[PDB]
Symmetry: C6
Subunit: 219 residues, 6 copies
């Protein structure tokens, strides 16, 4: 990554053994559960494109997902090149060349080039551009690997309302419902999918009930 | 987080793998037992709003609780906006814009904006404002998930008085009794709920007995 | 805590994940065995009152003990206020206000106030004052939770003298005998409580025998 | 390794216990699965040739592989010497001598010589030259130890298409197919090797189907 | 401990959680096996007397040994006071007072006094003086707790000579034989205590045989 | 060890708990397998003679090996004294005295003396001299403890050629064959010791076959 030292200048630091192991272990334990994505983003704080490729390449399983991710990255690289074409022909001596899509993705750029860009005044933030493409790709994989439709999450006859609600919002998160839909489902599908006794109590609460209010009512 | 370097200026540092893992593990092991809240506060020392969202988003279960927390955050954001409206229309060039509720909660502000605020002279402490809203939300969840009324904590016939007292104050803490109530319950409900033999001994101690005095008496 | 940086000025540092976990784990494994107290003191090196409250609040069980500790803290705070009353009425602008008992205990003082005091020239050592009150409280709890009188530690008929001595001094430590009593018990109760064969050998050694001498004699 | 200190000059630092243990453990757990190679590269960030030999020499098993690697290293050293012959006869006093192949591989050069080269202006990057030879060697070993031809990866009759795809691309990676072949196999051998029901569905999708499209189709 | 910072002045640093736990765990796993003593010395590198007392006080078992150690410490303190008596009567204002035995042992001196001494030019090395007394005490305990005389270590009839030699020198180390005795026992008691077949072979090797030579002979 | 600080001067640092534990654990798990020696060398990067003795003294078993090592060290110390005799009679005031063999081995020199030597301009590298003697000793122990002659490593009738080759080179490494012998054994004893089917195939490959070529042939 690039960090500020103890005196305030921006320099390269090697990726740590603790960071490398944290990422490999979270993929082993959680696969593509939705909370893996904010973990990746945090573990890659300050990352160069080289570091981002190291993190992805250290994963041993999930090679169908890693091939889908490559396909997303190539699509974003091709849209960058459409928006930001670069001059062909030789580099001005001692000067920096502009990055192409494959330079952002770390496949045709050196570590020194990447440092040059990220520490320019002002920075050309190649690590953050690439991280956004990767996270776009990862969210597609999360949605693909979500096993269950929200239509099929219904409260069991003896199931505590809290446990049902946990299943419901776990599923909405993996299915990638917008926050608007999440805030709205509370007056609709969450009630419809409740068991008969709780459905009666919720029906009588009326409209405008908060989630806290619904949870206390069916406690 | 924002920290002072080894030379004394306030700068951004990436959240550590050890901090990320500590928080995820404490939620896995303890859920919303009351001691999780002081742990969250300590683990988020110096946090930006970005860091606070990372901590909350890295939690994989408990999605009913995370939706209730969002609802609390939105309520506090809306009260901030009532108290501190911001000018509409374009930013003064090179200057800082004032934060709205959703800027405090990290949803409409960038990391650079958050650093600008927190390191202004004097600071606009957006990380500490947001942390207070989150902890307000978390304490509601603790109270909701408390399984047992203090009325139902009574000493068993062969139960050591110390073990009964531990159950009693564990329950008062989750039910969120004020410290006044905790200090007061010692002359009342703690005695009423004791077994017959200990109740007799405590009755005869009189009023004004400390907890230490009651514990020695029923030892 | 407050530490000296790499250049020698006294500044605040966040409490570490390793410190937080060390303390919670030692309470889980050892409860109020006497060696927990020197561990608390060491783990709280350089602590502010805020840090001391964090350590105590992160404990999940033992709520009878934590309520007794609050009672001790309130008693010491009330004696501080008797010895060191503070001026009522408004703060001198930009100047520091004197601490009251509840300011020392971190309940009515801010982190910034606590830093101001501890880094004044010369320091008003609010962290060390509070730590002394806490340790006074903790030693009472250790004595209360000691399960066995020294009168009831007697050597078994086939019990190795070394194992008996370990039981004896483990018990004296929890019962909070002074070092004078510990040094003295060697010529008295340690012999009286020995089994018949070892008691005979120790009787014949005479007075003035060291512990080493008694241990070799009954080996 | 060579690192920049907190003030920005390039200096030697000892290899850490955490780095040493990370590498030995990844070889114990994964052997020569393809993801071990990006792990080696990352763990050896900033390495001298001395450090690279330490990492390889700390491996206890896999001595057939370590002998094959020595053979690769000797071949690259001999090609370096063909391209870059060095002057025979005595060193200019106080000056640096040019590196031979065995100097790059750390067998005939001292640590001080290696530091001299790597920190020259501009650097003679002996650590990175050697690391490239080692990784060339390691990729040969990965290919040798790949147990299964891509021809023999076929979808079972009840095997989820995702699990089949994971097996397919895991195998292509160990067999060292180029990225062109990986991107191309999707319109060919991946379909041919599918079970009858999925093969029918994929045949009807037509040409140009992405991997994501094929995975959804056979879900 | 006292350490040199990153800029070269001698300052106090808090004892670490890793150091505290390392020591408690080595006593739990090894008790007073002889290799515990070099471990204590290393773990207490740079220690103040306060730190040395913390390490000893964090031990929970072995209270017969900790009482014997106190007795040794008191004997060394009393010999220091015989050699280095201190002036009675009031301290010169702002100046340092000379240490007594109980000041060295940390029982009547403050942390600030101990820092003053250890960082004086030239230092009065109170931490190293106390550590020597402690190690004197610890070596007595090791000798006391050694379970077996060297006379009773004899090679079994099918016991590999190497395993016998390991038992022999493990025992000599706990019994605290001088290095002269260890170097000498090789021509004597090591042969006498060997089984009949190996004794014959060793007898015929003659005098002056190294340990390596004896081990190869009976292999 | 001696390290360069963050500002570039050479100073003493205490040996770490992580280094101490790493070494003790590798001896517990691996004993004197050959890969323990490069691990010792790396873990002792920058070591003083004091640190080297700490590492060796913290080992609890293997006391026959530790006595053999002492014997090697004494032999190297005696050859140093033959090559580099020192002046008898008093030290020049404030100046440094020259090291004798037992000063190099840390038995008659202080820590301060060792630092003086290692940080002289130019250094008298007492830590590296001693480490070379120790490693000479350790390699003798590895050879002594090697359980099997290369003559007795022969391929089983159903044993995969790769597994046989791993056994063969594991044994050559412990027996301490030179690299010339290792490179040469491939055209000779490795073939002779192969099973009948593989021996036939290897015989027909001819001379000059690489190890890779032989491994593919018998795959
Ligand atoms: C413009 C092409 O960009 C890449 O293929 C970048 N990349 C790698 O280099 C290696 O690892 C990956 C794994 C998953 C997705 C992408 C990559
Ligand atoms: C004004 C809206 O503020 C949020 O929703 C902030 N927030 C997030 O961004 C993401 O994670 C959360 C989890 C639980 C509660 C709040 C959030
Ligand atoms: C003057 C009142 O001081 C306190 O109650 C300080 N205190 C806390 O704030 C919170 O945690 C505690 C736990 C056990 C004992 C005391 C406290
Ligand atoms: C020009 C000869 O270069 C080497 O043999 C370097 N080398 C070593 O020194 C020791 O460990 C190795 C293990 C596997 C491959 C190579 C090496
Ligand atoms: C002159 C008296 O010196 C001590 O008693 C020092 N001391 C302690 O303070 C506390 O812990 C110990 C444990 C074992 C031995 C000695 C001590
Ligand atoms: C000139 C004599 O040098 C030593 O005996 C150094 N030495 C020690 O001090 C203590 O530990 C050892 C263990 C194994 C071998 C040597 C040592």
């Amino acid at each position: 990554p690039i960090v500020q030292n103890l005196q305030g200048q921006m320099v390269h630091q090697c990726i740590s053994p603790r960071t490398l192991n944290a990422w490999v272990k979270v993929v082993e334990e959680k696969a593509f559960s939705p909370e893996v994505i904010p973990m990746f983003s945090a573990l890659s704080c300050g990352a160069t494109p080289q570091d981002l490729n190291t993190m992805l390449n250290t994963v041993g399983g999930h090679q169908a997902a890693m091939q889908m991710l490559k396909e997303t990255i190539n699509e974003e690289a091709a849209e960058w090149d459409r928006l930001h074409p670069v001059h062909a022909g030789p580099i001005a001596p001692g000067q920096m060349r502009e990055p192409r899509g494959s330079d952002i993705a770390g496949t045709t750029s050196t570590l020194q080039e990447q440092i040059g860009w990220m520490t320019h005044n002002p920075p050309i933030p190649v690590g953050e551009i690439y991280k956004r493409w990767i996270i776009l790709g990862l969210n597609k994989i999360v949605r693909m690997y979500s096993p269950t439709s929200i239509l099929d999450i219904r409260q069991g006859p003896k199931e505590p309302f809290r446990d049902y609600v946990d299943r419901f919002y776990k599923t909405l998160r993996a299915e990638q419902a917008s926050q608007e839909v999440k805030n709205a489902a509370t007056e609709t599908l969450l009630v419809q999918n409740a068991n008969p006794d709780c459905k009666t109590i919720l029906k009588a609460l009326g409209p405008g009930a908060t989630l806290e209010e619904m949870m206390t009512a069916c406690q």
